[PDB]
Design a protein around this ligand. Structure first.
Ligand SMILES: *Cc1cc2c(nc3c(=O)[nH]c(=O)nc-3n2C[C@H](O)[C@H](O)[C@H](O)COP(=O)(O)OP(=O)(O)OC[C@H]2O[C@@H](n3cnc4c(N)ncnc43)[C@H](O)[C@@H]2O)c(*)c1C
Ligand SMILES: *Cc1cc2c(nc3c(=O)[nH]c(=O)nc-3n2C[C@H](O)[C@H](O)[C@H](O)COP(=O)(O)OP(=O)(O)OC[C@H]2O[C@@H](n3cnc4c(N)ncnc43)[C@H](O)[C@@H]2O)c(*)c1C
Lengths: 498, 498
């Protein structure tokens, strides 16, 4: 029963609320509204619609682009005081308010019930944007995607006459709003309405105890953390190491691999970081787990002159996950300007692509220790659901991620140049982007990159929405037109009505 | 309420619960109990008391010693599921459950009400251990200590016949249980009973809106982050630089100073880290704030050959707090073995003390980039209260902290040896410890060091409890004897009964 908070520019809170994970994008709304209940979210939306104010929602503030914080946004509804996480006995499902962050969700579900779901590895990421986009992370090979556990979603929606209401859309075959549910299984945030809460549960959960409503993770993991110095690293070294990584991953990316429990992430930093790094984990209860880690690490070095430094240890699951998570505070999180890009794979990068990568990663006229591209193990259980049943593209065996991070606004041009040119040269056979084909599956909507709609950087002729949604876009457009006929919810990459 | 959770070794959660911030201490109780309400805490305690079991409580798990996780502890009550933070209209105060962490508390208080209290800069620290010890942090010069806002505390206590009850003790002069309240304003955790929740408010708050019930921090700060290269450092530069810092701080540590708003921390890492580092901040609204920071930075450099690297920027308060905060995840936070020590000053270290420090900080036969001593600005508003009114020692102008962090158990001996020897040598004129005198004021109970009770390291004849509690120890023993007559709550540094 606390009234919703309104923060105008004369309130000291305004400048803080204007800043989220990417300091490139400082919001300047008329006001921020912090509601405490779904009813208050309806009130906020209804006010903005009545006066034609442009409204966007913020949950965790992790957007890679200015979708929330665009200068033309008049009202930001910030859901960070709606962060409740708990078992909803009536639905047999864990209720997660949109303002809950992934770090907090995991701690609560694990300690109280012993359960988890396969969401990302960054602590401050909001449920609101994360889940609707097709959340994944380190347990996805074993458990699938977050949306594989999406039982129901509560959404504040706006009809053609501007009347604002709340609907609960569920997974059930007879649900008349099942289309709205489907759109939230990969359609991405900022598109259909304000998500106020999600409900999560295994579709085949046994009984009705919470301890059975979501999967139990493996109890403990063998963890390896590895690094290769840049000092003596040569193009030959780099290209063989990455090719060995992709080789091994592509042989081991299905539920049939006895190595499917093994997850690894290869972080190819720019030379100025001093090392390439990898982390890997495998559950203790996999047949011959410790040796499987050894086999994998051996194959990696086979044909590589740089010997990696290597630390190996055993940890409980939640510690493993926290050890690898990205902090939401400290110099890596706060006051940081960023640019991210994304491209997903179902076959290897060629020798030529990797040498192109090398040129930019080894470039000595550039200095940015945070500049990197990453190769992220994927597949497994992600790829054995019926793909039609959710909106997220499936078929990638492996994900790639590029990022640069800096603090000085004066260096914007060089960091943006660096990342744009590396991504372009890697995809220079396919118009500078990962056009869905035999090798590329496209890109991930939770790492949006407006350069994909920029004819200077995308010369492929393939539109941004095909890269992010494949064949699912026309269905998303139909649902959008049904549920947001006035196009209240929009941004540079929002689903365009027909 | 959901029934309290019981976790025995057959549950996958047990190995996770056994580990907290310091991996040197792995607990092995009969069970962990995770209660959800005061009544469930009473029940947990009443069980343990009945059968004579040794019980300890964990909130955030940041204890620097094995007070919670001793091998002889039979039951650990983990309060991490009691983390509510909210305004309590009936008391006109903010209610904070013991298991709320400080990072969380700040975010809730600030975004919802625009207020804060001066607690520490580490994200995962639990209210439960933190407040009762006299928590401080970067705003303490301006706002005082956390315990300067302690309106009331709810504690589960055990009488002489072993009957368990709950009491609320308040700061009001006529409160029959004001002694219990006073004990929680510096007496420290694990002593008097199980703290279930705290209430916070300014003693002179206007009216009863929550926006007035705690102080508003400054809206924004100028921040300076400085580093000096170890490759360029000599002994004489080190001695002069630290001397410059101490002199400036000791001229500027009272509320009378026009620089009182400037807070700075100097981290003197071991050579293997590659640099000394300092962060400083001053509110933007202080008269001539930007210039005051320049004046300060110039004084540090006078007579010092090494030029430091420096970045300066302006940030909102919560952002500057988060920029400097220590993460609760990532490699620095998880799976780490640690040893900490503490020494507080009201006068400067001598030149010989500083060359003794240089000797251990440049020692090339040691390697640990996490090893450091720190000098932490303090005083101001902390020292303008009636000191009798709380249990915390007051009088320090400046705090110092020593830490070594590592991961391999094989290295324990050399890290423990390094921190013990540096601290002993720095304090060799006073038997290896900061005996309260004209320069030392003692040490902080929230960085406990069992070496102060070890006659091999403490040769001063001054007992651990004098060093941590000043002259307040016998009054605390009297309160202990009244409120925990059976000595149910104890650990190596617990208040001993009269
Ligand atoms: C910053 C960051 C992002 C990460 C990280 N690691 C990830 C991982 O391991 N797996 C992943 O699957 N994704 C990872 N990501 C990407 C994040 O998933 C995306 O950045 C999410 O979109 C972020 O969600 P959120 O934090 O809520 O970001 P916002 O900026 O608030 O909103 C994003 C987008 O979605 C809309 N939106 C937010 N909230 C709602 C609600 N309630 N209803 C409708 N729409 C909403 C916004 O308007 C905006 O358009 C690791 C790191 C460090
Ligand atoms: C790890 C860490 C500690 C820090 C950090 N920064 C601090 C700062 O900026 N200012 C400070 O003033 N203190 C800082 N500290 C030190 C912490 O204040 C102490 O380490 C606290 O004691 C931590 O409290 P908590 O996280 O709750 O630790 P526990 O290990 O659970 O318990 C400590 C101690 O207290 C007893 N206790 C806990 N909970 C209760 C309740 N509810 N009732 C009674 N007694 C309780 C325990 O049994 C144990 O004896 C920065 C960092 C990174």
């Amino acid at each position: 029963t606390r009234a919703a908070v309104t923060v105008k520019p004369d309130d000291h809170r305004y400048d803080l609320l204007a800043r989220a994970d990417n300091y490139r994008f400082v919001a300047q709304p008329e006001y921020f509204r912090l509601p405490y209940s779904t009813a208050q979210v309806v009130e906020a939306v209804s006010e903005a619609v009545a006066a034609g104010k442009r409204l966007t929602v913020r949950s965790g503030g992790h957007c890679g682009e200015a979708f929330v914080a665009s200068p033309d946004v008049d009202v930001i509804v910030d859901l960070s005081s709606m962060s409740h996480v708990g078992y909803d006995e009536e639905r047999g499902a864990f209720e997660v308010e949109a303002g809950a962050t992934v770090g907090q969700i995991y701690r609560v579900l694990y300690k109280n019930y012993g359960v988890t779901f396969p969401g990302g590895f960054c602590m401050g990421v909001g449920a609101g944007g994360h889940i609707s986009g097709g959340g994944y992370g380190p347990l996805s090979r074993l458990l699938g995607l977050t949306v594989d556990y999406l039982h129901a979603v509560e959404v504040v929606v706006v009809d053609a006459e501007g009347v604002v209401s709340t609907v609960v859309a569920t997974r059930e075959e007879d649900d008349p709003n099942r289309d709205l549910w489907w759109a939230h299984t990969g359609g991405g945030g900022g598109n259909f309405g304000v998500i106020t809460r999600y409900w999560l549960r295994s579709p085949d959960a046994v009984g009705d105890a919470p301890e059975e409503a979501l999967p139990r993770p493996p109890a403990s993991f063998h963890v390896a953390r590895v690094s290769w110095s840049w000092a003596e690293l040569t193009e030959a070294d780099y290209v063989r190491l990455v090719s060995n990584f992709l080789d091994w991953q592509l042989r081991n990316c299905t539920v049939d691999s006895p190595n499917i429990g093994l997850y690894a992430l290869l972080e190819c930093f720019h030379r100025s970081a001093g090392h390439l790094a990898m982390h890997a984990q495998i559950p203790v209860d996999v047949p011959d787990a410790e040796e499987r880690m050894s086999w994998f690490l051996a194959e990696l070095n086979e044909g590589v002159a740089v010997a990696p430094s290597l630390t190996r240890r055993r940890l409980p699951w939640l510690a493993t996950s926290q050890l690898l998570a990205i902090p939401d505070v400290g110099p890596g999180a706060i006051g940081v300007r960023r640019k991210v890009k994304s491209a997903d794979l179902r076959g290897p990068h060629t020798r030529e692509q990797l040498a192109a990568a090398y040129r930019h990663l080894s470039r000595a006229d550039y200095h940015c220790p945070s500049a990197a591209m990453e190769y992220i193990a994927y597949g497994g259980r992600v790829n054995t659901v019926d793909p039609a049943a959710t909106a997220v593209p499936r078929g990638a065996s492996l994900k790639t991620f590029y990022m640069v991070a800096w603090t000085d606004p004066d260096e914007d041009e060089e960091h943006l140049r660096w990342i744009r040119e590396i991504y372009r040269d890697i995809h220079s056979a396919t118009g500078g982007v990962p056009t869905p084909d035999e090798v590329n599956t496209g890109a991930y909507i939770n790492y949006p990159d407006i350069d994909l709609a920029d004819p200077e950087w995308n010369t492929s002729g393939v539109p941004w929405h095909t890269i992010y949604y494949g064949d699912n876009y026309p269905r998303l457009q139909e649902i959008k037109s049904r549920w947001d006929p006035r196009n209240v919810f929009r941004h540079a990459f929002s689903i365009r009505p027909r």
